[PDB]
């Protein structure tokens, strides 16, 4: 199931198994770590619309006397 | 959303208050720059 897909993704990118096997750069591993993390968390397989409320909240967080009256063009 | 912001603000104001009270009751009864040495190494 999700485990089988996941263990396959790690192995394809070289994240699992022996490294001294006899008979990919590290920086690309971290990019693989980033890519796998987002893919396999369907809550953030894909969820239905509306299960998450992140877009509502992020808009909210984005939402003194005398003034520097700047009339420069 | 404003409810959470108010709770955080009141916690900050109260926490700062107790620290201020603690300083006075402590007061009533050298080198400022050590930390640079640690941050210098990284």
């Amino acid at each position: 199931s999700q485990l089988k897909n996941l263990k396959a993704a790690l192995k394809a990118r070289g994240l699992t198994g022996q490294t001294n096997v006899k008979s990919y750069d590290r920086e690309e591993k971290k990019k693989a770590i980033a890519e796998i993390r987002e893919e396999f968390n369907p809550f953030e397989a894909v969820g239905k619309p509306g299960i998450s409320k992140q877009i509502g909240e992020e808009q909210r967080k984005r939402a003194k006397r005398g003034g520097v009256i700047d009339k420069r063009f | 959303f404003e409810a959470r912001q108010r709770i955080e603000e009141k916690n900050k104001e109260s926490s700062d208050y107790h620290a201020k009270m603690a300083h006075i009751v402590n007061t009533i009864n050298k080198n400022k720059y050590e930390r640079e040495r640690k941050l210098r190494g990284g």
Binding site: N41, E44, S52, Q54, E57 | R4, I7
Partner: protein, 38 residues
């Protein structure tokens, strides 16, 4: 106006990364609070 009770949290991303970080550190150390046979 004042609010009587604690607001129900919002699971933003930054909460999500923080939670999963702690899960990974627990398993990295194998620090598992699970029942064992006695």
């Amino acid at each position: 106006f004042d609010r009587t009770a604690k607001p129900v949290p919002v699971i933003t991303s930054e909460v999500t990364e923080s939670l999963e970080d702690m899960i990974r550190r627990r398993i990295q150390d194998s620090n598992f609070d699970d029942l064992q046979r006695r």
